[PDB]
């Protein structure tokens, strides 16, 4: 739609921060500080697929807007994420353990920006077309 595509990494703000406050390990901080990854989007009916592609770590995602799943996220937390659209907005929550954390993807312009929340931690990530 406005997301379909394959979206290129062009920036990102605090996504160390994030990260910590997550409570990944320094190791994989490190690595995935320094990713630049591609997200490919598609949908077929009411099946939406997310697949970020790296260097050191490949990740890929199907859903139904409203359909609660199990998600191993690339740090390898396992989680429930539900995601749904909101104001033109793919907002995801994943829930793990008692926390959550809110992964909210818009367009703009050209652009994916994509922000990410934990606690008191805002990232935001900014994709442009490949
Ligand atoms: O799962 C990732 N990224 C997602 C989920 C949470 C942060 C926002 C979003 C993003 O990067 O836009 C992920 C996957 C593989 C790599 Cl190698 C990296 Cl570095 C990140």
Do not use: H
């Not at 394959?6 to 605090?14: A, D, G």
């Not at 990260?19 to 990854?37: D, I, N, Q, S, Y």
């Not at 790296?54 to 937390?77: M, P």
């Not at 990410?116 to 990530?125: H, P, Q």
């Amino acid at each position: 739609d406005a997301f379909v595509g394959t979206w290129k990494l062009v920036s990102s703000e605090n996504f160390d921060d994030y990260m910590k406050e997550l409570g990944v390990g320094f190791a994989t901080r490190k690595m995935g500080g320094m990713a630049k990854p591609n997200c490919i989007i598609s949908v077929n009916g009411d099946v939406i697929t997310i697949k970020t592609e790296s260097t050191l770590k490949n990740t890929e995602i199907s859903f139904i807007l409203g359909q609660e799943f199990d998600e191993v996220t690339a740090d390898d937390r396992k989680v429930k994420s539900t995601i749904t659209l909101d104001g033109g907005v793919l907002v995801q929550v994943q829930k793990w353990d008692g926390k959550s954390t809110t992964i909210k993807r818009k367009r703009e312009d050209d652009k994916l920006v994509v922000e990410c929340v934990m606690k008191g931690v805002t990232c935001t990530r900014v994709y442009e077309r490949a």
